[PDB]
Design a protein around this ligand. Structure first.
Ligand SMILES: *[C@@H]1O[C@H](CO)[C@@H](O[C@@H]2O[C@H](CO)[C@@H](O)[C@H](O)[C@H]2NC(C)=O)[C@H](O)[C@H]1NC(C)=O
Ligand SMILES: *[C@@H]1O[C@H](CO)[C@@H](O[C@@H]2O[C@H](CO)[C@@H](O)[C@H](O)[C@H]2NC(C)=O)[C@H](O)[C@H]1NC(C)=O
Ligand SMILES: *[C@@H]1O[C@H](CO)[C@@H](O)[C@H](O)[C@H]1NC(C)=O
Ligand SMILES: *[C@@H]1O[C@H](CO)[C@@H](O)[C@H](O)[C@H]1NC(C)=O
Lengths: 72, 495, 495, 72
């Protein structure tokens, strides 16, 4: 709600700082981290399904990083 | 003035094709322009007012429920119902409880029951739109010469404030003693409202993309509230929780203030309190020269006694702004000024104020030069050469061509299209340059909009790779496509 | 009683190994148990109180700023500072403004300036933990026989309410006329607190996972507030926006009520108002039989005149609960009851009340049988066979074995481990069954926890595939691994 | 904040409905949809990078669905 689908890259970027300097921008990733750190269990899982699904090294790397960020 | 020490900045040495200067200005920017004549100018626009807008929508964020009743009817025979549902001013829900035999009902098995509440909103926020007609920009341009007013006097009176509304087109700027600078603002292609949604909020506001504004959840009103409360929704908030089976009732689900804020995290701040004057804008226009003559050019280049009053700063490679203080030889006149090279005359220092001119045998004027890269001498004053001030900069040629490459590149990848409007006059280059970045920009780079910056660069990478280990020529184009453009926007963007 | 028509439900025909019944109950559940003797019982636990907890943390959600001041010092010489920063009761920020020459400062270029505000919180919420010692569960079990009290009288007095706290172990239940049922609750492995975090909130609450509760952002307190306000953080809320360059000030960033709610969207509801009695729990225990005899078994199986008072319902394949009303032949006695097969005697109807017994020559009792699949006859009363009521169900054998397969499976994939505690007695099966699902459960299926259900099933799929088109035997295990377990949890879960 | 990392699958699932019946659960996807619908531009992009990165059909399908949900 006023929690998600937060007017971000709609497209009115303007030379002068917006509403959340960069705190918001950085924060986001900052929290996946907190999370992933929390349940290595899933990091584990993910990377695995990775290792097998795909094959093209880069492939793996890719779906991996995703799955990670996919689950908030 | 009005710009000396403002970080954001930029110059424009050139009048071209007879007065044709092409400039773009955005609040914390002040564009300054020089010419092979004319007291160069410092342009800075500020107050950009809007007037007579309209309330288009009205999401509320502190809902509150009352009167709440609840009916049930029993297994099968009757999807329960009562009067209250009539007054859409309420809220309701048909649900299934296990009304059993002992419950004091019918023939147990399962049944219907609805819940209903009169829904009063407590503090909505209200959007607002503004027809571009009524988007009064204020432009404040000014000379130099200096004085007690000095640099960034801001709060005073110099250059005046020529206000311009597209409810007109070109405006004359009566500049004392100099003449009349003429500007052709294009306030109709700058911010680009009626695409934008002015939005107040408990007393603070945000300019925000129309779409998003017509999607954010919440219970909404229309435009003509005036005692209405027939809030389309309410379902966004208020929830009637039904534990395991029986009971089943309603609840507020709390306010939404801060929530709202946090959600709104991409729009720029603004105003609403004080005739909503939305800064942050950035309009362009043709600054039209001619009829804009320098002051002196008449009285002698007078000689005499003169001290100084301050050393010299320099924010932005070259901003040598020096304070002096003539005396003795009286009567308001010129000033002998040179930016010569250590002893051995071969002068080579860019002048920005284009000759000062004392005026009160007191008036400690101040010049503004752009000394060369290494060490430079500012020889100011003839006869016994009364004064030569040795200084030294750091105008390191290359360090220059680079910081420019970027800073410029930036002004590009912020404004887009109109970036080219910074280069006064076309001729295939800047003219067609725009013509292309115009569409190639509005397309790809601008047709995959709305994605958070993070994801943005992510695609940069995945693509640089799908590129990099390509297969015959096409890659180069693929890489570039990646590099800069995206990869860069990202490493930049997020205003 | 106390269960007739409650959806959630379940029976347990069997006493096994001398009184060893193994049961699990969770509020909207009521477990009912039959035996080759003993007036079967309906078990339902309700009020599960907690007492003497402690406030561990205290996030606030309606921050408000005051007194706010701001200092600046000038280019280089001085990362600005002032008194206010001393009283940690404030908030501050060292930032860079472009303090320029005219600004009325030093030697322009760029400089420092901090902002500071005294930070008062306005309405925090407060967490809370409860030592399992002081987790008083209330268990209410009861007979049948029926009466005016009838089914789900709830608000009355039948079976009494034997309250049990692990601050004791086994409790006797003095059941009028019958004897004393003995229960061995294991209130110490049910909900599993001190892993759980009781959390009030502006007057409503939520039981919530300890971790998450010690991470959700916001400005927090400690446990011993009592005039403190030295809120570790504040940085979570209050933000000082710095537009383009100059100014730079602070702001609240609004309340957080609803936000909070929406965030908290996985915890169960609860209480706090009225000695916080957190429902939703689910404890297990050994229901210990013996010393639990049925009432009659003495007075004759009396014959006489008797009408009926209501037809028959059936929520849950077989819940034939019939109202009767004896008369004439007086004195409180038994009742001839059979669930015979259409005319041609060959009786085959499960009895659940194990003989009623009239008692007031008025008392319209009510029996409770589980008639076969097809059509069945409830012949109640000898002599001129005074009454035979033809009925018919739908106990469609197979439809049964299936809905059970699931409903059961459910009770499994909700409680986990203890699911096996529903099967009274071990012997390799249920005993080792648990022993395995115990760890194989707590592991994989339970070691990739915390992911939203959506993602959950997503992994189900990606895995069923990485399985499905496998390579030699191992796949079957891979599939199953996918199928049910996950794929299913998902298509289910999300309480 | 009290906007994200919302106590979800911590693990206290209980026979009785939680705090957001299922409205929340369904809602989530409901909004990616609203979004994707909004800027087909990205759906476009995504699916493409897809078509090329990977190759193993299922692969494609996979990183695609992801990228989609990856960008809120
Ligand atoms: C800004 O402009 C004002 C306008 O002149 C300057 O203020 C003057 O300051 C002198 C010094 O004491 C006074 O004697 C004048 O009376 C002031 N003018 C009035 C009437 O306001 C001020 O110094 C300038 N400061 C800057 C650089 O912003
Ligand atoms: C619940 O139990 C109460 C307790 O008996 C039942 O209430 C009785 O109802 C009769 C009918 O009028 C009264 O004459 C009694 O005085 C009531 N008892 C009292 C004193 O409360 C009630 O009928 C039962 N209802 C159910 C099935 O929940
Ligand atoms: C709302 O319900 C309250 C019940 O306390 C009642 O007093 C009030 O008059 C009701 N409002 C109306 C006019 O419907
Ligand atoms: C806070 O600032 C206000 C300024 O209006 C002042 O009146 C008040 O006394 C201050 N509080 C204290 C005691 O610091």
């Amino acid at each position: 709600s006023v929690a998600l689908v937060p007017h971000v890259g709609m497209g009115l970027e303007t030379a002068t700082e917006t509403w959340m300097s960069s705190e918001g921008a950085w924060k986001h990733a900052q929290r996946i981290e907190t999370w992933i750190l929390r349940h290595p269990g899933f990091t584990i899982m993910a990377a695995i399904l990775a290792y097998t699904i795909g094959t093209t090294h880069f492939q793996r790397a890719l779906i991996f990083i995703l799955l990670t960020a996919v689950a908030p | 003035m009005r710009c000396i020490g403002i970080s954001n900045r930029d110059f424009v040495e050139g009048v071209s094709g007879g007065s044709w200067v092409d400039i773009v200005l955005e609040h914390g920017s002040c564009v300054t322009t020089m010419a092979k004549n004319k007291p160069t100018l410092d342009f800075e626009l500020i107050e950009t007012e809007a007037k007579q807008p309209a309330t288009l929508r009205k999401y509320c964020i502190e809902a509150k429920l009352t009167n709440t009743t609840t009916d049930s009817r029993c297994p099968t025979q009757g999807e329960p119902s009562l009067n209250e549902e009539q007054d859409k001013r309420f809220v309701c829900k048909h649900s299934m409880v296990d009304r059993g035999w002992g419950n004091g009902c019918g023939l147990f098995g399962k049944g219907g029951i609805v819940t209903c509440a009169m829904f009063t909103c407590k503090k909505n926020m209200k959007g607002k739109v503004v027809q571009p007609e009524n988007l009064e920009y204020t432009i404040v341009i000014t000379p130099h010469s200096g004085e007690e007013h000095a640099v960034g006097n801001d709060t005073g009176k110099h250059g005046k404030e020529i206000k311009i509304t597209p409810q007109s087109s070109i405006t004359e700027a009566e500049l004392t003693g100099y003449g009349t600078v003429t500007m052709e603002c294009s306030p109709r292609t700058g911010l680009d409202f009626n695409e934008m949604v002015l939005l107040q909020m408990e007393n603070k506001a945000w300019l925000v993309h129309r779409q998003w504004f017509l999607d954010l959840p919440l219970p909404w009103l229309p435009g003509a509230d005036t005692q209405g409360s027939n809030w389309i929704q309410k379902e966004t908030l208020v929830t009637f929780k039904n534990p395991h089976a029986k009971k089943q009732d309603v609840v507020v689900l709390g306010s939404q203030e801060g929530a709202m804020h946090t959600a709104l995290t991409g729009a720029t701040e603004i105003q609403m309190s004080s005739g909503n004057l939305l800064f942050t804008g950035h309009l362009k226009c043709r600054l039209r020269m001619d009829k804009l003559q320098l002051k002196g050019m008449s009285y002698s280049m007078c000689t005499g006694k003169f001290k100084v009053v301050k050393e010299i700063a320099e924010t932005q490679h070259g901003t040598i702004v020096i304070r002096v203080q003539y005396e003795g030889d009286g009567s308001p006149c010129k000033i002998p000024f040179e930016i010569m090279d250590l002893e051995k005359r071969h002068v080579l220092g860019r002048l920005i104020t284009v000759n000062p001119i004392v005026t009160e045998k007191d008036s400690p004027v101040n010049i503004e030069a752009e000394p060369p890269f290494g060490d430079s001498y500012i020889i100011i004053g003839v006869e016994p050469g009364q004064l030569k001030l040795n200084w030294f900069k750091k105008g390191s040629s290359i360090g220059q061509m680079i910081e420019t490459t970027m800073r410029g590149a930036k002004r590009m990848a912020i404004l887009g299209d109109t970036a080219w409007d910074f280069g006064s006059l076309g001729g295939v280059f800047t003219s067609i340059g725009k013509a292309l970045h115009q569409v190639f920009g509005a397309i790809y780079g601008a047709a995959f909009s709305g994605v958070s910056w993070i994801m943005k660069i992510l695609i940069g990478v995945i693509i640089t790779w799908i590129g990099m280990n390509s297969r015959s020529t096409s890659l180069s184009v693929s890489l570039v496509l990646v590099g800069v453009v995206t990869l860069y926007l990202g490493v930049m963007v997020q205003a």
